[PDB]
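Internal ticket #5521
Category: modeling
Description: The requester needs a full-assembly model to guide mutagenesis choices. All entity lines are attached below as received. Residue total reported by intake: 823.
Assigned to: D.W.
Attached entities:
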Amino acid sequence: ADVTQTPRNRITKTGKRIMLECSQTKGHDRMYWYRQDPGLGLRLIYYSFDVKDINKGEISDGYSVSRQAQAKFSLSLESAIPNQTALYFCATSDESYGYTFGSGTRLTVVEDLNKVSPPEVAVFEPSEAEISHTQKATLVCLATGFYPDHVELSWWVNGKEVHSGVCTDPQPLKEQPALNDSRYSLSSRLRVSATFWQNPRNHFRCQVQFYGLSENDEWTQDRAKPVTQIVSAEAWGRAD
Amino acid sequence: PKYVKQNTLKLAT
Amino acid sequence: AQSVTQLGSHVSVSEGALVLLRCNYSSSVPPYLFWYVQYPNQGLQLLLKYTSAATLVKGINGFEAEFKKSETSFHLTKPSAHMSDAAEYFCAVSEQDDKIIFGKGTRLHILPNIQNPDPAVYQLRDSKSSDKSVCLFTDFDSQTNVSQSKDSDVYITDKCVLDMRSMDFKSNSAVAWSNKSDFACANAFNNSIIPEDTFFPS
Amino acid sequence: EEHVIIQAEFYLNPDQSGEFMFDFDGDEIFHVDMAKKETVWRLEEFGRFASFEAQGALANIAVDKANLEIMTKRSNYTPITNVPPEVTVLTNSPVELREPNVLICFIDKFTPPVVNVTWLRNGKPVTTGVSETVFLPREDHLFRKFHYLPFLPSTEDVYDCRVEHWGLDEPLLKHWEF
Amino acid sequence: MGDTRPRFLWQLKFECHFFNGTERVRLLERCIYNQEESVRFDSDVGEYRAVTELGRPDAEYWNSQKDLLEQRRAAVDTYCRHNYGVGESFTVQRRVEPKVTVYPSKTQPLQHHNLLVCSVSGFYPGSIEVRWFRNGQEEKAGVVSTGLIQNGDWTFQTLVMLETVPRSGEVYTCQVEHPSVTSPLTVEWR
């Protein structure tokens, strides 16, 4: 990749200064930072056309940048607030409106790190009635009780990641929609042929990658520190 | 009404 | 004031039908115009770019867009919607100022051609426990929508489309669950208009 | 009729000096002040009818800078040959006693675009009211410049524009009296 | 500057050439290293061409990029015609009336060889005719002029002097035709 951003995923508490790093290898003079939010598209934060050149975009307030070198363009949240939760994209441009976007930084700003909680994951087996009515078999994964909303769910069949026959909810729902810091739930389906499900050597795992606390973050609670971790649940096929 | 520049291109390297 | 206006945050198209995504622009200057796609859980990919070279711009996968100065439009088209076209699409303008201003984006939802609907509500048991389960509503066509629960202790997902490549087969589903003792799969979707022929196994 | 509009840029090493200007039929429309990211209209009127996004100039100069380094390396670090300026000294209008005019020092046919210009009134260097244009383009890729001194005409005062340039073996000193 | 270091200069020109307004437009892009042009794009050719061996890699790399060449050609409309229309009111259509004064170069009696001066200054555009009249009749013989002087200013100045023997009752008129005037300006000396 020409353009690389670090980190790829960050949780931070409000009131903290945090820095996102963009680096490029095509030696382009134009660099940009955008943020993406649901329903608002990408909005330009800052842009730079040379070393030590800084220009305000649409939404520069609460942000600063540095361009000490041609290869690198740094974005800082001055004092992180929850509405700075977004997908951040660094871009370079050539001399003829050819943009290269980085793969993005998912940043979540929480008011209270005490509320961070990894998912519980359960796998629900296909009903006999479905198998017998359709000759297909639907597994359901439920990931529950997590905070913040910062997970990636994948299915693994016989130790290989599968995309075929999978649907995951595009956004988690709130377990307590009245609360500002409600925990989240997410579901996913994996559908397979009944014959594949009925082979008891077949192994099905739903994996949830959770982004949470780092080594640095302090933790005063009795429950386990809610670090970045994978939680999974699994089921084997059955002949019945 | 806005003047537009034409972009300078990078030489071959 | 360089701007671009897309109509509709969420739009639908039937599988196999013409794709049309609208974009109107505002510029004092002959503009650069762009369409980008963001495929699920990935970054931004340029589809095509207007440079004043030609009014009909062609891109990857049958995408095209026509610049019409007289209605300041740059509508994206594709001849046939595939399930893999499900994505967010962004139009973008530059008043020749070496920065791209983006529209708010339109997500394209593809309605699968369900030739043999078989709507059913199944109970699925937890792998780890005979005491835990969820309810799966599945195999309904495009005319059924799932409503959210009226009951704050009953959780119901939006409908999702999956594509089983092993059998070239697409299906709709929604999941409902509850910790409530009086929760049964027969009642889970009572707030939804379901097909009269929905299968409820014993 | 017949008109020519020129977008003229340069970058000079090791001075690290760059300019960006538009020319219409041999007069400057504007240039960009790189330090302040401001468009500078040659007459203030022009800024009332048109705009330019000054920041655009800085992207072009960044690429000029990258290209000058590539061409320098390609030429095996062959430097420019100094071409000395010609200096004309003249008046903005005809000259009447005690009616304020402006003294033009016109500097022409020179490269690279680095000159030191001094205004001497009766031997004293004078700075009051002084201004200058940027380095203007010529068809042969040499430069022109204008330096300006507003003044009260009288038989008392004698004038010199002193120009220094690397192509000259001593400073050129051009005289004006009434 | 006592500084002896070698200098390295990069110049770039984008030239838009307008015939009969925007009826015919030509675009010339020019890359210039140490005062020597290396590569150019000419809209009349429609691709890059090395002007010297140093430019050959750049002509070849740029001409390699079809979409790049297509936009450079469209710029006759999206750059040249556009910027022409931006500036037209205050550029092409700029009219500033000349100040015209006429005085003798020497105060001297009638019947003697004199130089009568017609200074015309502050004017724009550059196009102008100054013609010398004796009692109603023009003359071309003894007319000397400093030609057109560019003030750097968006103004021009000119002198036209007339070698002449002034006689009792003779009226001398300087006649100036400039695009700013509904009909020529005239200033007399009696």
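Resolution: model delivered.
Comment from assignee: Chain C touches chain D through two residues (CB under 8 Å).
Ticket closed.
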